[PDB]
């Protein structure tokens, strides 16, 4: 059904492929050519998960796991039973993720709005492809990619990390974590600021953006503004994911020893490298 204000916006057009063939809705959902492709890649993918669970011998959601090929398979294809399914599924998952993004472009065009959302979404699609495609290829085996299972994908995180000692010492991991931590701070403030102004003390009128800017200046001496906090939120979370892909593309490719040891370049700078005392020497 339709929101009270919605009919005036459901006009023909904005499609990228197909013209007016799939230009329609199903309940609230816009379909479009990439609505259909999403559904196709998604349903093909889910069928293959369930097949993988048949061969594995379990129907328990906390036990289904679809592993990549072994390392000795390098970058070739493996049999379905032993890593082939992961290969086909990974193709499907990508099919569905890009069709999702392209379908959002179409929704944007119909609505006359900017393309910022699919653009932001592509960065998450980037990160996924780093872990399942770009990193395995540079290393030379699909087996370095993570498995598709709820708890087993976590065991991969923990094993991969500890191959390099305390992964905390990856400098790109550090920056990535800062951006994640800051984005949440920023989000909490942005949410609290709007609500605190729309929902003032009992009996008082709605505050204004003047009150929002006054509050930040009184608090920290600077207010970034209402347009700028939205730029800030977009930028922080996009950078967070960017440096995540970065900390992972370099790990095991250009750097493969323990990450704590990478920091000896600083300590071993020649002008202070032998001054006694302190922690190092």
């Amino acid at each position: 059904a339709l929101l009270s204000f919605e009919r005036k916006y459901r006009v023909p057009g904005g499609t990228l492929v197909g013209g007016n063939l799939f230009d329609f809705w199903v309940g609230p959902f816009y379909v479009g050519f990439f609505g259909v492709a999403t559904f196709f890649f998604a349903a093909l993918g889910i069928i293959l998960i369930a097949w993988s669970a048949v061969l594995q011998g379990t129907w328990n959601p906390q036990l289904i796991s679809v592993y990549p090929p072994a390392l000795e398979y390098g970058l070739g294809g493996a049999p379905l039973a032993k890593g082939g399914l992961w290969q086909i599924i990974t193709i499907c998952a990508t099919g569905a993720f890009v069709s999702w993004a392209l379908r959002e472009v179409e929704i944007c065009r119909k609505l006359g709005i900017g393309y910022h959302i699919p653009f932001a979404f592509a960065f998450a699609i980037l990160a996924y492809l780093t872990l399942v495609l770009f990193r395995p290829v540079m290393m030379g085996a699909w087996g370095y990619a993570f498995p598709y299972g709820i708890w087993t994908h976590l065991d991969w995180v923990s094993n991969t990390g500890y191959t390099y000692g305390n992964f905390h010492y990856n400098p790109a991991h550090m920056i990535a974590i800062s951006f994640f931590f800051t984005n949440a701070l920023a989000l909490a403030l942005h949410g609290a600021l709007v609500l605190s102004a729309a929902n003032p003390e009992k009996g008082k009128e709605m505050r204004t953006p003047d009150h929002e800017d006054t509050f930040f200046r009184d608090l920290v001496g600077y207010s970034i503004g209402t347009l700028g906090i939205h730029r800030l939120g977009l930028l922080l979370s996009l950078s967070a994911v960017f440096f995540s892909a970065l900390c992972m593309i370099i790990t095991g490719t250009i750097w493969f020893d323990q990450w704590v040891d990478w920091w000896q370049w600083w300590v071993k700078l020649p002008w202070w490298a032998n001054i006694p005392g302190g922690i190092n020497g």
């Binding site: 709005i113 910022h116 653009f119 949440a184 953006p209 979370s237």
Partner: peptide, 22 residues
């Protein structure tokens, strides 16, 4: 929260041609 704030900021910029930041 990275997901939410990505969507939210992207959206408000997408609709700032209609004064959405307000």
């Amino acid at each position: 929260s990275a997901l939410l704030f990505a969507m939210h900021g992207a959206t408000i910029l997408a609709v700032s041609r209609f004064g959405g930041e307000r």
